[PDB]
């Protein structure tokens, strides 16, 4: 079993995140709290930490990319190896919800970037391109 990240169509993150989870799939999509100006108001609010994305905890022998795409909603798999769908790390995953010299130092400053950034949408960027990191750690190291 192992970690994924679906990309959802405009406005089906929900509906899919339903369906993979009536089939055996576990799904994570976290919200983030945030103090925005609402209307001149800098009201506290809880939107996606990084919107349109859905985490999928599956095993490519039991269900593979192929069915969870068919999902009603996914769009897509992110991808390393451009042909395989990405697997994050087990240790990108624990940063994203309680909270070596290269994963620390990457998946660390990572997250608190992401925390810190005020839209998601940058934040996905932030977090592509930090997943992107810590597979070619795992790779050549």
Same mark, same amino acid.
């Given at each position: 079993? *192992?970690?994924?990240? #679906?990309? /959802? !169509?405009?406005?089906? #993150?929900?509906?899919?995140? %339903? ?7 576990? /799904? ?9 100006? &609402? ?12 919107? @349109?994305?859905?985490? &999928? ?20 798999? +992110? ?9 994050? *790390?087990?240790?990108?995953?624990? #940063?994203?919800?309680?909270?070596? +010299? ?6 660390? %400053? ?6 810190? %950034? ?10 592509? @391109?930090?997943? @992107? !990191?810590?597979?070619?750690?795992? +790779?050549? @190291?």
């Amino acid at each position: 079993q *192992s970690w994924y990240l #679906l990309y /959802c !169509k405009r406005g089906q #993150l929900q509906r899919a995140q %339903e369906h993979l989870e009536r089939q055996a799939v576990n /799904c994570l999509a976290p919200m983030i709290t945030l103090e925005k100006i &609402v209307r001149g108001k800098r009201t506290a609010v809880s939107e996606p930490l990084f919107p @349109n994305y859905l985490f &999928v905890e599956f095993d490519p022998e039991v269900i593979h990319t192929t069915t969870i795409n068919a999902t009603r909603g996914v769009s897509h798999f +992110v991808r390393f190896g451009a042909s395989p769908a990405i697997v994050p *790390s087990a240790v990108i995953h624990q #940063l994203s919800v309680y909270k070596k +010299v290269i994963i620390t130092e990457g998946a660390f %400053e990572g997250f608190q970037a992401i925390f810190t %950034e005020p839209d998601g949408e940058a934040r996905s960027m932030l977090l592509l @391109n930090l997943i @992107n !990191k810590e597979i070619k750690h795992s +790779v050549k @190291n």
